[PDB]
Design an enzyme around this catalytic site. Structure first.
Site, PDB file in Angstrom:
ATOM      1  N   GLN A   2      26.562   7.104 -26.588  1.00 40.71           N
ATOM      2  CA  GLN A   2      25.503   6.498 -25.785  1.00 40.71           C
ATOM      3  C   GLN A   2      25.909   5.057 -25.401  1.00 40.71           C
ATOM      4  OE1 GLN A   2      21.101   7.385 -26.273  1.00 40.71           O
ATOM      5  NE2 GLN A   2      21.433   5.479 -27.447  1.00 40.71           N
ATOM      6  N   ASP A  32       7.672   9.966  -7.560  1.00 35.79           N
ATOM      7  CA  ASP A  32       9.003   9.937  -6.899  1.00 35.79           C
ATOM      8  C   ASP A  32       9.493  11.273  -6.465  1.00 35.79           C
ATOM      9  OD1 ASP A  32      11.847   8.995  -6.692  1.00 35.79           O
ATOM     10  OD2 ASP A  32      11.041   7.240  -7.791  1.00 35.79           O
ATOM     11  N   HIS A  64      16.992  10.409  -6.778  1.00 32.60           N
ATOM     12  CA  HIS A  64      16.261   9.146  -7.011  1.00 32.60           C
ATOM     13  C   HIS A  64      15.293   9.201  -8.179  1.00 32.60           C
ATOM     14  CE1 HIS A  64      13.405   5.833  -5.691  1.00 32.60           C
ATOM     15  NE2 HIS A  64      14.479   5.330  -5.121  1.00 32.60           N
ATOM     16  N   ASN A  77      19.766   8.842 -28.342  1.00 33.21           N
ATOM     17  CA  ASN A  77      20.545   9.917 -29.053  1.00 33.21           C
ATOM     18  C   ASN A  77      21.995   9.444 -29.033  1.00 33.21           C
ATOM     19  OD1 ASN A  77      21.141  10.375 -26.368  1.00 33.21           O
ATOM     20  ND2 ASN A  77      19.859  12.237 -26.168  1.00 33.21           N
ATOM     21  N   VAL A  81      22.707   7.516 -21.732  1.00 34.07           N
ATOM     22  CA  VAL A  81      22.172   6.148 -21.659  1.00 34.07           C
ATOM     23  C   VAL A  81      20.976   6.016 -22.536  1.00 34.07           C
ATOM     24  CG1 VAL A  81      23.352   5.764 -19.425  1.00 34.07           C
ATOM     25  CG2 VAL A  81      21.054   6.762 -19.451  1.00 34.07           C
ATOM     26  N   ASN A 155      13.189  -3.402  -0.135  1.00 29.03           N
ATOM     27  CA  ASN A 155      14.590  -3.778   0.021  1.00 29.03           C
ATOM     28  C   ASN A 155      14.806  -4.495   1.398  1.00 29.03           C
ATOM     29  OD1 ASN A 155      15.339  -2.758  -2.600  1.00 29.03           O
ATOM     30  ND2 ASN A 155      15.567  -0.696  -1.683  1.00 29.03           N
ATOM     31  N   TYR A 171      -0.342  -4.840  -2.645  1.00 32.97           N
ATOM     32  CA  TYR A 171      -1.719  -4.947  -3.161  1.00 32.97           C
ATOM     33  C   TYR A 171      -1.767  -5.673  -4.479  1.00 32.97           C
ATOM     34  CZ  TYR A 171      -2.715  -1.266   0.410  1.00 32.97           C
ATOM     35  OH  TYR A 171      -2.851  -0.553   1.593  1.00 32.97           O
ATOM     36  N   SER A 221      13.943  -0.244  -6.275  1.00 35.27           N
ATOM     37  CA  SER A 221      13.551   1.029  -6.895  1.00 35.27           C
ATOM     38  C   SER A 221      14.013   1.090  -8.341  1.00 35.27           C
ATOM     39  CB  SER A 221      14.128   2.281  -6.229  1.00 35.27           C
ATOM     40  OG  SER A 221      13.369   2.572  -5.101  1.00 35.27           O
TER      41      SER A 221
HETATM   42 CA   LIG Z   1       1.328  -9.442  -6.606  1.00 33.91          CA
HETATM   43 CA   LIG Z   2      20.862   8.979 -24.531  1.00 36.66          CA
HETATM   44 NA    NA Z   3       1.000  -6.996  -5.935  1.00 29.28          NA
END
Ligand SMILES: [Ca+2]
Ligand SMILES: [Ca+2]
Ligand code: NA
Length: 275
Positions: A2, A32, A64, A77, A81, A155, A171, A221
């Site tokens: 890992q 997503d 994504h 584990n 990662v 972006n 918002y 993202s």
């Molecule tokens: Ca804000």
């Molecule tokens: Ca892992």
């Molecule tokens: Na905001």
């Protein structure tokens, strides 16, 4: 073996991990492109698909959603990662199709699902240049219902003196997240404006990809799930805090960077935020 992605360490998550805080019993929804539930380094607990032509939330044809999800909760584990909150209950709310786009009605349906299903934290690594009364209403209701709502800022880089933060990040009820690099420098692509709240690592982020893969992606993202994951660690330590307290703690304990128009409050530090 890992590997711990730089970004996990940068926000100080491992410190919490060491204490026994890893997001257990916190329900996080990744709204997503779906999550590959077959990935050995992820554990999907549930979810739903609001994409009419792609009815299985556990198939990610884009890559994504799976990448965002590993930042939040790649298991602890001996493989791959490590997520920010590796013990969280991960929900795949599929609202983007294979091409990485989706309609507003689908995204909103997914937020409604998350409220109804008692998600603790919502991650939205998506955004558009225009808002809607329905989009605002849905994020507002989530927050009024005690959900922590986290979104990627966008972006769009800089544009004169105007805000380039998209919706729903714009918002006020939402936490808008911009991207830094490993040196704490703002990524040139990261959206800017007064609505920007915090920063998180968003350049060359290593995470999971569909089909038992790993690879890097860059974008706000990738920054947002570090914050969503951070709110999950906080709730694991202080199950009785309101979404309000979680948010104030994150904002109030950042490492300050440059101007708030570019950096918001600075880089989150979960160790400090968790008290
Ligand atoms: Ca804000
Ligand atoms: Ca892992
Ligand atoms: Na905001």
């Amino acid at each position: 073996a890992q590997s711990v992605p730089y970004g996990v360490s940068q926000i100080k998550a491992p410190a919490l991990h060491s204490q026994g805080y890893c997001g257990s019993n916190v329900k996080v929804a990744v709204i997503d492109s779906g999550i590959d539930s077959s990935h050995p380094d992820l554990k999907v607990a549930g979810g739903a698909s609001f994409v009419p032509s792609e009815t299985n939330p556990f198939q990610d044809n884009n890559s994504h959603g799976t990448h965002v999800a590993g930042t939040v909760a790649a298991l602890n584990n001996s493989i791959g990662v490590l997520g920010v909150a590796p013990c969280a209950s991960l929900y795949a709310v599929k609202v983007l199709g294979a091409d990485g786009s989706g309609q507003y009605s689908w995204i909103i349906n997914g937020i409604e699902w998350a409220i109804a299903n008692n998600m603790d934290v919502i991650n939205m690594s998506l955004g558009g240049p225009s808002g809607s009364a329905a989009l605002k209403a849905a994020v507002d209701k989530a927050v009024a219902s005690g959900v922590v709502v986290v979104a990627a800022a966008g972006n769009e880089g800089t544009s004169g003196s105007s805000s380039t933060v998209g919706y729903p990040a714009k918002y006020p009820s939402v936490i808008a997240v911009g991207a830094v690099d490993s040196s704490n420098q703002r990524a040139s692509f990261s959206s800017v404006g007064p609505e920007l709240d915090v920063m998180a690592p968003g350049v060359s982020i290593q995470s999971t990809l569909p089909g038992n893969k790993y690879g890097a992606k860059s974008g706000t993202s990738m920054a947002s799930p570090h914050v969503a994951g951070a709110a999950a660690l906080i709730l694991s330590k202080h199950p009785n805090w309101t979404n309000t307290q979680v948010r104030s703690s994150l904002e109030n304990t950042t490492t300050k960077l440059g101007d708030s128009f570019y950096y918001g409050k600075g880089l989150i530090n979960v160790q400090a935020a968790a008290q």
